[PDB]
């Protein structure tokens, strides 16, 4: 009940694998009556982990570590795994039963309607395939998860209704539909047909500030919307940015991979300093991400063209040809301390929107998709 005090169901030490730096560390966990699963560095006598076990899927495994268990949940259209280890099979069973008990207490379109044309991405949890709806001839990206990912029928129905309720957010790939077969969960989403921004930057080598400002503005707008609904994108990078047919930005939702890395040696991804430090991270990682993308757009290369050390300790250098305002924007977005970073304060995207670099931007025209694009992608077929 909501009026009742939140109470501890089960508590104790667990070994947990890091989210981004995939290394084992001992943590003290409290499973709460409201579904919070809260992790501290030491036993309380400021939590480092806090997520919900509501709607989760629990699995036993013996490899790599014996007495390992995985809490898997679906976050929007993306599988999130959290991996834990205890010292015996009996201890694991007690944890799994506790977690499951708490999760229990809180409780036509087919695949033959599509032509399957081309692979768009793959990863450990499934694949994204370019599809054509047969009856309409309209193209979509179908993100198909592997059979191992079991999700409840009420949870998929919730995501479909919640996608429909939110229909102004023009620069995100909209979820069109989601459905289950006998075995698999499929998400039908919009496909941007203007190509990869990674490709366009490679083709052109570098963008002008004007063009970079245009794409930056659209990203800033998209991030303002997500952050206003308490959503961190986490993966702002060139590979996750596409253009639609008109040349406007689409941020993608094609994640199928496990997050993170074994250690700092095996990274090239520019994770936020606070992520690398293994600290409290939040919405400020997206402003870092924007910093790195805009640096790439305007300079034609990543900041450190040893990367763990360089991100933590070394200052990002600017070409002399960058304007003072561009230099200032990038310096602000690439501050190592997320409290000092442009966008890291209470006003969030407003700080970025008010920066000298963006003074020519009409932000009403941005969100209404009314700023005219400086580049129109060449008109391709959908398969090409
Ligand atoms: C508020 C608008 C609707 N909406 C919700 O209601 C609930 O949460 C949402 N989450 C995401 C979203 C999607 C992937 C990510 C990731 N990179 C981080 C990750 C590992 O989880 C994949 C992070 C967040 C999105 C989204 C969809 C398309 C493009 C960008 C973001 C939309 C919503």
Residue numbers in the entry: -1 to 43, 50 to 111, 146 to 205, 208 to 307, 314 to 351, 357 to 435
Publication text:
AKT is a serine/threonine kinase which plays a key role in the phosphatidylinositol-3-kinase (PI3K)/AKT/mammalian target of rapamycin (mTOR) signalling pathway and is involved in cell signalling, proliferation, glucose metabolism and protein synthesis via phosphorylation of two critical residues, threonine 308 and serine 4731,2. Small molecule AKT inhibitors are typically either ATP competitive or allosteric with respect to their binding site. Allosteric inhibitors induce a conformational change through binding to the pleckstrin homology (PH) domain, thus preventing localisation of AKT to the plasma membrane and therefore inhibiting activation of the pathway.
The allosteric binding mode of this series was confirmed via a high resolution (2.32 Å) co-crystal structure obtained with a close analogue of ALM301 (compound 3) in complex with AKT2. Compound 3 binds in an allosteric binding pocket ca. 10 Å away from the hinge backbone (dark blue) at the interface of the N- and C-lobes of the kinase and PH domains, similar to previously published allosteric AKT inhibitors. The crystal structure showed compound 3 binding to a DFG-out conformation of AKT2, restricting access to the ATP binding site.
